[PDB]
């Protein structure tokens, strides 16, 4: 009757929560955290210093949105965190109220973006070992968890370790290949554009292309993206002229409800049905620094690894992540990759003649469930493995060596 | 002929030109090419610009240009780009030379496909119609600037590294090896790391931006363990540089590990063995009478070897190899072993010196070059070797 | 040497995986040349000798003179820089060092084995070279069984099956009492 460990997938967006050895993440709540801050002016020599017990006088989760007298302040920003005191407060609140798990008799696994600096991991591990006194800890990249969860798509019994994952995120979407359990360290790239700035662009365009909404209830209006309201588009200008020609049937309407005066307000739906999701393959719209597509990045990263691994990698691309829920995404990526790889093969064959014909490279995109969350099941299987109880860093290791035990990274080595 | 000869090294990163019998190059310009581009982010046209521009002007006006590199690792990618660069350097404002009555010296990298040499010689003979040309190996162009008839060259530069040991003058082709490491790669890596720090960078012009930062701040270490402990125990090694736009960035730890890829190619996905280890293996694989002479005389050629501290790391590594793989830790017999790395002050440009000195005495006699006449015949090429 | 020359052609291979790839390429598309100069001249007319190989990634590599260049290193060790002689010269020297009478028998019987001697035409080239070096008054025969790869294993199995060899083995008792030096005196 051994107690199960605890599985947590922290991040910038909706933080997944639940226990190991289970088939559904029970709690999925935002990162919004309340605080009894107000208007002091001395805010850089006493940030808060709440007198008495007012320090803990703050809510958390979905209940924290509807508190109109505090401040909703997200602690995370695309992985990197400025102030981690809010993170500690959120962690204690969750573990006690929601999870109800005693740290001294439980094992915690945490997930961080691959670009997280060593200092943040070291100091969060130190904080955990000092305050929570967790017997064991383990941090790993989320790509492998997604790969493990991808087995459920079809033929679980057929072991398939090779592949590559392009995961989404509220502020980051990364690319990580797997070569029979061992990933490549140098063949990893970080994409800054993600599923948040897209909504920023949507609302920015909407605030001028339409009127009839209140400033407060903007994001709820901007969340038409999460609805059926965005389809990807093999061509841009074609659909532009399609809308500018008819502009009658392709236009949709919004019927949101105000959260203050309970007065209905409506606005039409325009070019944003596709432009947002199209920004992924044209990031230049939002971020001027990163004028680089995604599919070509995928082929480049897959072309910077040994020959024997290039072939199977193209065959296994996993559709996991919230921002990847957009329809026809896989078709576009598959078609683009096939076109570029076929062109490269033809160029290679042109220089050296021959009547032969190489077997065409096969690129296939797999669509399945688990797309919204592919890290939780990986953590559950992580906990269920007995070897996890042995690999996890121990207390005595942190006792005198320090929190450096958690500094191991997949893209470092001397 | 005109008794006029110009020596050039159309390498990968930088291109140097000059006349024979010259102590230092007259003109030094890099290999930068880029069509005009307008960035909606910031900045607009201020001064004149042309559709195709190269040379030093790019180093100053890359802000509004799509800078691209034509050559890397000494191999041909874009025939037209190299043709444009050759036209520019041969124009009346860079060299101002008469093609029909001039001779040139070329220094192609060792261990490269013959197609590049054939294409370049054919282009020179047809498009520009030079009376005669020559191709030389870096070994002579280096050892001939100080009077050395024996040694091992560790020439490193943009592209790939190379080695060409020579004993008593006669060549030893079967003891040369190539590795996929160079300055460009050390650059890609300063970049993955400052990205971690949290800065977003492109691959168009900032690639040239990081060049100065690597030149000033980047340095190599003596012992990895001590330097790493110092970095993690102290923050005095932190330094910055003023960007052209006035932005300020902090780099204290990434400035040290980038050169370490030279001795640890594992960091950049290469199954290398290390420059020092490779040198030791190459020396050992030779005969015996030549090992001591090779060790006694050794040169550190190339601009990419100007990193501060490389000689110390190399000599220490070589001594460690000698101790562990020969004497099995017997330090007492190790004392008498001696090494003297040859590091001329003019390590930024030595090939040009060798070419100038060669042309000084190899100009009067016409039986040295591939004269224009032989080109018109078939069953040709591989005239000399 | 094959890797080095493949570099001169335009194809680069450094790591061990490409070492295995080049090993397979040599195993599949290499042969010996009866005459080196004639083969080089025919290569100058490169329209019937080049062959193509399919890499795992799908890239196609065209190999010409390299097919008959690397095997020639056996007969011309100077290519790698080794100051030695070829297999023909070494065999001639070894046979000459023997007694005069047994030279005839040694010439009449020349067994070859190993995985490096499967190149087609190797036997003919060796025969021609030996006959040219040896006096042209007797007959030299080369025997090339088609199962020379496992000849050593077959011989070991046959020797073990021999009844007389059941007593020549070395057991634990005698080894422990005597020591490791026993094997040195056991049939040299």
């Amino acid at each position: 009757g051994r107690l199960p460990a605890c599985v947590v997938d922290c991040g910038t967006g909706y933080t997944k929560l639940g226990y190991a050895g289970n088939t559904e993440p029970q709690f999925i709540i935002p990162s919004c955290i309340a605080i009894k801050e107000s208007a002091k002016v001395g805010d850089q020599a006493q940030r808060r210093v709440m007198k008495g017990v007012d320090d803990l006088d703050f809510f958390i989760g979905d209940e924290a949105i509807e508190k109109p007298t505090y401040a909703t302040k997200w602690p995370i920003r695309h992985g990197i965190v400025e102030d981690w005191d809010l993170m500690e407060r959120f962690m204690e609140q969750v573990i006690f109220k929601y999870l109800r798990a005693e740290p001294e008799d439980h094992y915690f696994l945490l997930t961080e973006p691959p670009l997280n600096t060593p200092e943040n991991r070291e100091y969060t591990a130190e904080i955990m070992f000092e305050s929570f006194n967790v017997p064991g800890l383990y941090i790993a990249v989320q790509a492998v968890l997604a790969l493990a969860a991808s087995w459920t798509s079809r033929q679980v019994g057929e072991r398939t370790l090779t592949g590559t994952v392009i995961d989404s995120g509220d502020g980051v979407t990364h690319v990580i290949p797997v070569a029979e359990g061992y990933v490549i360290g140098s063949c990893i790239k970080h994409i800054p554009i993600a599923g948040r700035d897209i909504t920023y662009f949507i609302q920015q365009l909407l605030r001028d292309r339409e009127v009839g909404i209140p400033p407060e209830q903007s994001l709820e209006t901007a969340k038409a993206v999460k609805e059926r309201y965005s389809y990807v588009c093999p061509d841009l200008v074609k659909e532009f002229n399609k809308y500018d020609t008819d502009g009658s049937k392709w236009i949709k309407q919004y019927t949101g409800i105000n959260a203050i005066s309970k007065k209905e307000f409506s606005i039409d739906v325009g070019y944003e049905r596709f432009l947002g999701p199209e920004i992924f393959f044209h990031p230049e719209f939002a971020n001027p620094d990163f004028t680089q597509p995604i599919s070509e990045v995928v082929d480049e990263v897959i072309q910077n690894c040994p020959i024997d691994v290039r072939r199977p990698l193209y065959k296994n691309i996993v559709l996991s992540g919230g921002s990847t829920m957009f329809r026809d995404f896989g078709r576009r990526l598959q078609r683009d990759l096939k076109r570029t790889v076929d062109a490269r093969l033809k160029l290679s064959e042109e220089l050296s003649g021959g009547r032969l014909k190489p077997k065409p490279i096969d690129v296939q995109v797999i669509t399945h469930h688990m797309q919204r969350y592919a890290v939780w099941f990986g953590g559950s299987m992580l906990a269920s493995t007995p070897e996890f109880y042995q690999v996890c860093h121990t207390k005595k290791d942190y006792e005198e060596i320090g929190p450096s035990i958690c500094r191991h990274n997949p893209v470092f080595g001397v | 002929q005109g008794r006029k000869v110009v020596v050039c090294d159309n390498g990968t990163g930088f291109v140097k030109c000059g006349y024979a019998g010259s102590n230092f190059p007259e003109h030094i310009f890099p290999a930068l090419v880029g069509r005009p581009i307008i960035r909606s982010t910031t900045k607009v046209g201020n001064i004149e610009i042309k559709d195709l521009m190269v040379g030093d002007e790019a180093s100053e006006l890359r802000s509004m240009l799509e800078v691209n590199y034509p050559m890397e690792n000494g191999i041909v990618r874009n025939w037209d780009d190299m043709k444009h660069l050759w036209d520019y350097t041969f124009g009346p404002e860079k060299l101002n030379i008469d093609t029909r009555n001039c001779k040139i010296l070329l220094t192609e990298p060792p261990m490269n496909p013959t197609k590049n040499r054939e294409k370049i010689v054919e282009v020179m003979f047809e498009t520009y119609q030079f009376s005669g040309v020559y191709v030389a190996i870096q070994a002579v162009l280096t050892l001939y600037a100080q009077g050395l008839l024996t040694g091992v060259v560790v020439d490193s530069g943009d592209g790939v590294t190379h080695i060409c040991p020579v004993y008593e003058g006669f060549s030893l082709p079967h003891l040369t090896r190539r590795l996929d490491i160079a300055g460009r790669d050390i650059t890609r890596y300063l970049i993955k790391l400052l990205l971690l720090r949290g800065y977003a960078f492109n691959h168009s012009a900032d690639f040239e931006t990081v060049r100065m930062i690597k030149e000033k701040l980047c340095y190599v270490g003596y012992n990895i363990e001590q330097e790493q402990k110092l970095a993690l125990e102290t923050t005095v090694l932190v330094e910055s540089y003023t960007l052209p736009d006035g932005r300020i960035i902090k780099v204290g730890g990434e400035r040290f590990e980038a050169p370490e890829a030279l001795f640890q190619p594992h960091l950049i996905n290469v199954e290398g063995v290390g420059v020092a280890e490779l040198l030791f293996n190459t020396i050992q694989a030779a005969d015996i009478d030549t090992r001591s002479e090779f060790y006694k005389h050794i040169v550190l050629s190339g601009g990419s070897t100007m990193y501060p501290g490389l000689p110390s790391r190399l000599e220490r590594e070589l001594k460690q190899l000698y101790l562990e793989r020969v004497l099995k830790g017997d330090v007492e017999k190790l004392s008498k072993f001696k090494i003297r790395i040859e590091d001329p002050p003019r390590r930024k440009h030595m090939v040009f010196l060798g070419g100038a000195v060669l042309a000084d005495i190899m100009k009067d006699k016409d039986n040295f070059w591939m004269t224009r006449q032989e080109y018109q015949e078939k069953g040709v090429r591989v005239l000399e070797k | 040497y094959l890797m080095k020359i493949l570099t001169e052609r335009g194809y680069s291979f450094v790591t061990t995986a490409e070492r295995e790839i080049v090993r397979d390429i040599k195993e599949k598309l290499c042969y010996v040349a009866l005459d080196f100069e004639n083969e080089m001249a025919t290569a100058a007319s490169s329209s019937s000798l080049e062959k193509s190989y399919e890499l795992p990634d799908g890239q196609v590599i065209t190999i010409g003179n390299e097919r008959f260049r690397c095997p020639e290193t056996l007969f011309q060790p100077s290519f790698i820089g080794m100051e030695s002689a070829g297999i023909h010269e070494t065999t001639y020297n070894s046979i000459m060092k023997c007694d005069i009478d047994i030279r005839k028998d040694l010439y009449a019987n020349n067994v070859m084995s190993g995985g490096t001697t499967m190149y087609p035409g190797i036997a003919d080239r060796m025969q021609k070279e030996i006959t040219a070096l040896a006096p042209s008054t007797m007959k030299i025969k080369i025997i090339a069984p088609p199962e020379r790869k496992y000849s050593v294993w077959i011989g070991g199995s046959i020797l073990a099956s021999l009844s007389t060899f059941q007593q020549m083995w070395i057991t634990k008792q005698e080894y422990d009492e005597a020591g490791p030096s026993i094997v040195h005196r056991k049939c040299f």
Binding site: - | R77, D180 | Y11, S12
Partner: peptide
Amino acid sequence: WXAXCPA
């Protein structure tokens, strides 16, 4: 390069 590495 043509095969192996880019150049």
